[PDB]
Design a protein around this nucleic acid. Structure first.
Length: 152
RNA sequence: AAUUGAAGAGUUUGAUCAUGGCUCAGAUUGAACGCUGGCGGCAGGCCUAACACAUGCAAGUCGAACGGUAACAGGAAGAAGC
C-alpha cells in the first residue's frame, strides 16, 4: 500500500590506512498513488542495512503532490545540480514513456500518463531530486485560481 | 472519424559530482556475405565502367493516290495430257 521501490545501489570506498572500507549506498522511493512521494538515500556497511535505512528515510520527509486525475495539469521543467527533467501532461496514451530512475518515481507517484524526459548528466539521485522538486513546484488549477481570482 | 505527442545503459577515479567524447539497445535499404530453405500472392533486380560490343528484333502503313505488274489464287483471253 505504501508503494516502495528502490532504484539503484552503489558501493563506496574510504581508502583507510589499513586498506579500503567498502560501504554501500542505496536509493529508494515511496508513495501510494495519489501524491505523497518520498525518497531516501541510505548508507551502511551492507546492502540490506543500506536499503532498510533508505526506506526508513523515505518514510519521513514525504511531500505530497497536487496531481490531476492521472497526470499533471500543465507541463513543467525541473532543474537540479546536473540534471534537467521535462514533464508533459500527455493525456490518454495508455501509459507512461519515462526511462530509468524516472519511470520508477512516477509509477510510485501514481501518474499513469506523462511525457517524461531527462536532459543532462543521468545521475539517478540527481534526476530523482529534480523530479521531486518539479513536482513540488507544480501547482494545481484550484490553487492558482484561489490565489489569482479565478473568474473562469 | 484526416500527426494524441519524446525512455536509456556502460566507460576517466581509491570512491563523488560535472564537463566531455567513445560504445550499445530501434528502425530502415536497389543491400552484400555465411548457414539454412516448403509453397503462394505482391513488389524489386548493373548503385560500380555515360567501359566496348557478336548476334536477333525493336517504324512501317496506305492499291480507297499513282505508272505498274516480279509475284501468282488464279476464275478467267486462248489452247490442251482431255
Amino acid at each position: 500500500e505504501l508503494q516502495e521501490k528502490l532504484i539503484a545501489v552503489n558501493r563506496v570506498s574510504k581508502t583507510v590506512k589499513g586498506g579500503r572500507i567498502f560501504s554501500f549506498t542505496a536509493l529508494t522511493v515511496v508513495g501510494d498513488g495519489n501524491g505523497r512521494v518520498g525518497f531516501g538515500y541510505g548508507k551502511a556497511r551492507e546492502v540490506p542495512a543500506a536499503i532498510q535505512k533508505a526506506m526508513e528515510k523515505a518514510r519521513r520527509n514525504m511531500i505530497n503532490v497536487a496531481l490531476n486525475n492521472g497526470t499533471l495539469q500543465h507541463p513543467v521543467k525541473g532543474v537540479h545540480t546536473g540534471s534537467r527533467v521535462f514533464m508533459q501532461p500527455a493525456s490518454e496514451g495508455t501509459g507512461i514513456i519515462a526511462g530509468g530512475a524516472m519511470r520508477a518515481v512516477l509509477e510510485v507517484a501514481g501518474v499513469h500518463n506523462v511525457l517524461a524526459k531527462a536532459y543532462g548528466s543521468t545521475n539517478p539521485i540527481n534526476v530523482v531530486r529534480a523530479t521531486i522538486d518539479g513536482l513540488e513546484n507544480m501547482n494545481s488549477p484550484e490553487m492558482v485560481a484561489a490565489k489569482r481570482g479565478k473568474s473562469k
